Amino acid sequence: QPLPDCCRQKTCSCRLYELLHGAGNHAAGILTL
């Protein structure tokens, strides 16, 4: 039932935080003023 450990079984929220930090070239460029 717990299903694959998706970051503390948080529904795999890391998925969004992954593309945001890893493939977030668009987000980083904006976070750098």
mmCIF file of N, CA and C in Angstrom:
data_model
loop_
_atom_site.group_PDB
_atom_site.id
_atom_site.type_symbol
_atom_site.label_atom_id
_atom_site.label_comp_id
_atom_site.label_asym_id
_atom_site.label_seq_id
_atom_site.Cartn_x
_atom_site.Cartn_y
_atom_site.Cartn_z
ATOM 1 N N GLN A 1 0.834 -1.232 0.000
ATOM 2 C CA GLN A 1 0.000 0.000 0.000
ATOM 3 C C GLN A 1 0.859 1.269 0.000
ATOM 4 N N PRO A 2 1.907 1.326 0.846
ATOM 5 C CA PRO A 2 2.789 2.497 0.918
ATOM 6 C C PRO A 2 3.326 2.906 -0.450
ATOM 7 N N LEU A 3 3.368 1.953 -1.378
ATOM 8 C CA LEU A 3 3.862 2.220 -2.722
ATOM 9 C C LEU A 3 5.312 2.697 -2.673
ATOM 10 N N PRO A 4 6.026 2.656 -3.816
ATOM 11 C CA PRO A 4 7.422 3.088 -3.897
ATOM 12 C C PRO A 4 7.677 4.367 -3.106
ATOM 13 N N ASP A 5 8.662 4.314 -2.214
ATOM 14 C CA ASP A 5 9.013 5.457 -1.378
ATOM 15 C C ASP A 5 9.178 6.729 -2.207
ATOM 16 N N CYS A 6 8.085 7.470 -2.366
ATOM 17 C CA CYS A 6 8.100 8.702 -3.126
ATOM 18 C C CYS A 6 8.352 9.897 -2.213
ATOM 19 N N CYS A 7 9.532 9.925 -1.599
ATOM 20 C CA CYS A 7 9.899 11.009 -0.694
ATOM 21 C C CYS A 7 8.965 11.047 0.510
ATOM 22 N N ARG A 8 9.124 10.072 1.403
ATOM 23 C CA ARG A 8 8.301 9.991 2.604
ATOM 24 C C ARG A 8 6.838 9.735 2.250
ATOM 25 N N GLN A 9 6.607 9.126 1.091
ATOM 26 C CA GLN A 9 5.251 8.827 0.643
ATOM 27 C C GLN A 9 4.412 10.099 0.566
ATOM 28 N N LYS A 10 5.038 11.189 0.132
ATOM 29 C CA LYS A 10 4.361 12.466 0.017
ATOM 30 C C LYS A 10 3.736 12.646 -1.364
ATOM 31 N N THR A 11 3.440 11.533 -2.037
ATOM 32 C CA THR A 11 2.840 11.569 -3.370
ATOM 33 C C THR A 11 3.884 11.916 -4.435
ATOM 34 N N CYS A 12 5.157 11.768 -4.081
ATOM 35 C CA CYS A 12 6.249 12.058 -5.005
ATOM 36 C C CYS A 12 6.316 13.549 -5.322
ATOM 37 N N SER A 13 6.158 14.374 -4.293
ATOM 38 C CA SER A 13 6.205 15.821 -4.459
ATOM 39 C C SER A 13 7.554 16.258 -5.023
ATOM 40 N N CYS A 14 8.579 15.438 -4.801
ATOM 41 C CA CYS A 14 9.919 15.741 -5.289
ATOM 42 C C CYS A 14 9.923 15.914 -6.807
ATOM 43 N N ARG A 15 8.950 15.301 -7.475
ATOM 44 C CA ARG A 15 8.846 15.395 -8.929
ATOM 45 C C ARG A 15 8.843 16.851 -9.380
ATOM 46 N N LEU A 16 8.035 17.668 -8.714
ATOM 47 C CA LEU A 16 7.946 19.086 -9.042
ATOM 48 C C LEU A 16 9.215 19.811 -8.617
ATOM 49 N N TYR A 17 9.736 19.439 -7.451
ATOM 50 C CA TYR A 17 10.952 20.052 -6.928
ATOM 51 C C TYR A 17 12.183 19.593 -7.706
ATOM 52 N N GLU A 18 12.012 18.553 -8.514
ATOM 53 C CA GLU A 18 13.106 18.020 -9.315
ATOM 54 C C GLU A 18 13.344 18.881 -10.549
ATOM 55 N N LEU A 19 12.295 19.077 -11.338
ATOM 56 C CA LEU A 19 12.388 19.889 -12.545
ATOM 57 C C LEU A 19 12.607 21.359 -12.197
ATOM 58 N N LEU A 20 12.315 21.723 -10.950
ATOM 59 C CA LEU A 20 12.483 23.098 -10.495
ATOM 60 C C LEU A 20 13.941 23.391 -10.151
ATOM 61 N N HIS A 21 14.634 22.389 -9.614
ATOM 62 C CA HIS A 21 16.037 22.551 -9.244
ATOM 63 C C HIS A 21 16.958 21.989 -10.324
ATOM 64 N N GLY A 22 16.588 20.834 -10.870
ATOM 65 C CA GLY A 22 17.391 20.212 -11.907
ATOM 66 C C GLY A 22 17.204 20.868 -13.260
ATOM 67 N N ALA A 23 15.983 20.810 -13.780
ATOM 68 C CA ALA A 23 15.675 21.403 -15.076
ATOM 69 C C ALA A 23 14.940 22.729 -14.909
ATOM 70 N N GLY A 24 15.320 23.486 -13.884
ATOM 71 C CA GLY A 24 14.689 24.764 -13.630
ATOM 72 C C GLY A 24 15.515 25.930 -14.135
ATOM 73 N N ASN A 25 16.166 25.740 -15.280
ATOM 74 C CA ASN A 25 16.992 26.786 -15.872
ATOM 75 C C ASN A 25 16.198 28.081 -16.030
ATOM 76 N N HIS A 26 14.877 27.951 -16.118
ATOM 77 C CA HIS A 26 14.004 29.110 -16.268
ATOM 78 C C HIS A 26 13.706 29.743 -14.912
ATOM 79 N N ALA A 27 13.636 28.910 -13.879
ATOM 80 C CA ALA A 27 13.361 29.391 -12.531
ATOM 81 C C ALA A 27 14.610 29.998 -11.902
ATOM 82 N N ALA A 28 15.741 29.326 -12.084
ATOM 83 C CA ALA A 28 17.008 29.799 -11.538
ATOM 84 C C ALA A 28 17.382 31.157 -12.119
ATOM 85 N N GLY A 29 17.251 31.287 -13.437
ATOM 86 C CA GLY A 29 17.578 32.539 -14.095
ATOM 87 C C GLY A 29 16.794 33.711 -13.538
ATOM 88 N N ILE A 30 15.603 33.433 -13.019
ATOM 89 C CA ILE A 30 14.754 34.473 -12.452
ATOM 90 C C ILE A 30 15.076 34.702 -10.978
ATOM 91 N N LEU A 31 15.522 33.647 -10.305
ATOM 92 C CA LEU A 31 15.869 33.733 -8.892
ATOM 93 C C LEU A 31 17.224 34.409 -8.693
ATOM 94 N N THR A 32 17.919 34.681 -9.794
ATOM 95 C CA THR A 32 19.225 35.326 -9.735
ATOM 96 C C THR A 32 19.112 36.822 -10.010
ATOM 97 N N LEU A 33 17.957 37.394 -9.680
ATOM 98 C CA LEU A 33 17.723 38.817 -9.892
ATOM 99 C C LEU A 33 17.871 39.182 -11.366
#
